[PDB]
Design a protein around this ligand. Structure first.
Ligand SMILES: CC(=O)NCCCCc1nc(CO)c[nH]1
Ligand SMILES: [Cl-]
Length: 301
């Protein structure tokens, strides 16, 4: 069995590289962030442009949704994160404390906390209500490429150009585990929180068993030597691994067999970001500044 993702919509409007696309947990919306300093909201099902959210003074590297689909958080080169009310487009809080570009961000499942990763080599944990920094983790010895909460928010996983993935106890900020050392460009937990998916800048994705601390699966064939490209667990139909690539394609692998099952063609630059819809067999992909578009794809499985 293989998926049959086909192009449904091309979403134009960003004037520089797209950096990140994310579906709202309720499946209604796609949010995109860009080097153009803007967040854009789009209909997940009709691709219809909804609104622009503005206020960052420099480019945005990442955006993430609260669990109720009402709030966004953005990570910017202006060294801040901003918490946004999606309905009003208003900036509710500016999260200050990082000393360099903020690269990655995520809410916990409760959405009382935000985790951030920065070029300043720290991971910060923030109170959503107050906008205050609760904890600063001296997490890494190079820029932090990704941060992600597990299923209940009890753990954070971080990755860095220093070649490490680290698992952190959210409550205490203490490191529970460190996983050659090529730069780690992306990491996230599996939906069940038992596994970690990690990208390294040697054109390799690895599935790690967190409990055992050992590599279970490797996914190759794509190009990733430069950019922090997002990767995804696709779980709505077949059990796939999804990633962008520096050869301008979306790669889809069989999680169990590690075989490439589809390559999506259409982008005219690096596919930096992919997202999987929470309920439908729908992928969003976004590309860098030769392309600047988002594409919505639909599969029967
Ligand atoms: C250096 C690089 O990859 N620049 C392209 C724009 C940033 C993309 C991005 N990836 C992540 C992974 O967590 C967050 N943001
Ligand atoms: Cl996703």
């Amino acid at each position: 069995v293989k998926p049959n993702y086909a192009l449904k919509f091309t979403l134009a409007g960003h004037t520089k590289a797209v950096s990140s696309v994310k579906f709202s947990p309720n499946g209604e919306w796609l949010a995109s962030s860009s080097a153009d300093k803007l967040i854009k909201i789009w209909g997940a099902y009709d691709g219809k442009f909804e609104k622009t959210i503005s206020g960052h003074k420099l480019g945005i590297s990442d955006v993430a949704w609260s669990s109720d689909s009402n709030l966004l958080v953005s990570a910017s080169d202006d060294k801040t994160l901003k918490i946004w009310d999606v309905s009003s487009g208003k900036c509710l809080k500016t999260l200050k404390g990082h000393s360099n570009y903020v690269f990655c961000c995520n809410f916990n499942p409760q959405s009382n906390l935000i985790v951030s990763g920065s070029f300043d080599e720290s991971v910060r944990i923030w109170d959503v209500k107050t906008g205050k920094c609760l904890k600063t983790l001296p997490a890494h010895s190079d820029p932090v490429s990704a941060v992600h909460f597990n299923r209940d928010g009890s753990l954070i996983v971080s990755s860095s150009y220093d070649g490490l993935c680290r698992i952190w106890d959210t409550a205490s900020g203490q490191c529970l585990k460190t996983l050659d050392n090529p730069p780690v460009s992306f990491v996230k937990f599996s939906p069940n929180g038992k596994y970690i998916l990690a990208a390294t800048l040697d054109n390799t994705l690895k599935l790690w068993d967190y409990s055992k601390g050992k590599c279970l699966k490797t996914y190759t064939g794509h190009k990733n030597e430069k950019y922090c490209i997002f990767a995804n667990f696709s779980v709505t139909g077949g059990k796939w691994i999804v990633s962008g690539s520096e050869d301008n394609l979306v790669y889809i692998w069989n999680l169990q067999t590690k075989e490439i099952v589809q390559k999506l063609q259409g982008h005219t630059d690096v596919v930096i970001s992919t997202a999987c819809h929470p309920t439908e067999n729908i992928i969003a992909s976004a590309a860098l500044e030769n392309d600047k578009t988002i594409k919505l794809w639909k599969s029967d499985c």
